[PDB]
């Protein structure tokens, strides 16, 4: 039910957003994700996540609910190939979500595993 | 404004309920804390907080809400000296809150300072 360990990797990194604790998508990001066509390095793209997020100087008490980036109801978590899988989400614009450039309305990420152990965001779109 | 401080602290406890990273915790809890009369280690209280988050063993996408929680709008901020102030505030009982046993409905914690820099949960009751 690898399914479940999707959900799994794509909560942490849903909660990583709302905590803004970004030291957990250390293992939930690839060494290289591609974002929006183009390849990344891991601390690069967690470094636009953090800076965006601070972009938004909002109250110390807002946007602490997935609800707040997601429509957890218009989730998809679909197999690609062995070592491949789709998540398709309706994702909502905040005063944090405009700040990521990357962040569509409808949103796609890939989740591939180099070791069939640990399945890791290679691309974001 | 240290009432400001105080709500960023809050938030840092209540993100690191969310997030289940408890890593977080440790910028918040004092060394000691008073748990409904009884003092205890951060460690022993920090592990107290995973163990019963563990105990709900919930969907990986249940409760990621501050909602889940608490009652955000019942929340009051209220200094009692030069080094103690007093929130209070309407919480909640999830699948997770009702294994923690500290957890009231109407919760008071004190956030103290030692080094009038850094405000600590030095009582949960």
């Given at each position: 039910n690898q399914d479940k360990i999707i959900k799994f990797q794509f909560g942490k990194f849903a909660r990583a957003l709302i905590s803004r604790?970004?030291?957990?998508?250390d293992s939930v990001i690839a060494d290289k994700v591609n974002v929006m066509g183009q390849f990344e390095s891991k601390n690069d793209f967690i470094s636009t996540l953090s800076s965006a997020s601070s972009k938004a100087?909002?109250?110390?008490?807002?946007?602490?609910?997935v609800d707040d980036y997601y429509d957890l109801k218009s989730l998809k978590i679909s197999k690609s190939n062995d070592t491949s899988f789709a998540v398709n989400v309706n994702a909502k614009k905040n005063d944090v979500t405009k700040?990521?450039?990357?962040?569509?309305?409808r949103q796609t990420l890939i989740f591939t595993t180099e070791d069939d152990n640990n399945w890791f965001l290679s691309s974001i779109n």
């Open positions: 604790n970004f030291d957990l998508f100087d909002a109250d110390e008490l807002e946007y602490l609910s700040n990521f450039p990357f962040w569509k309305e």
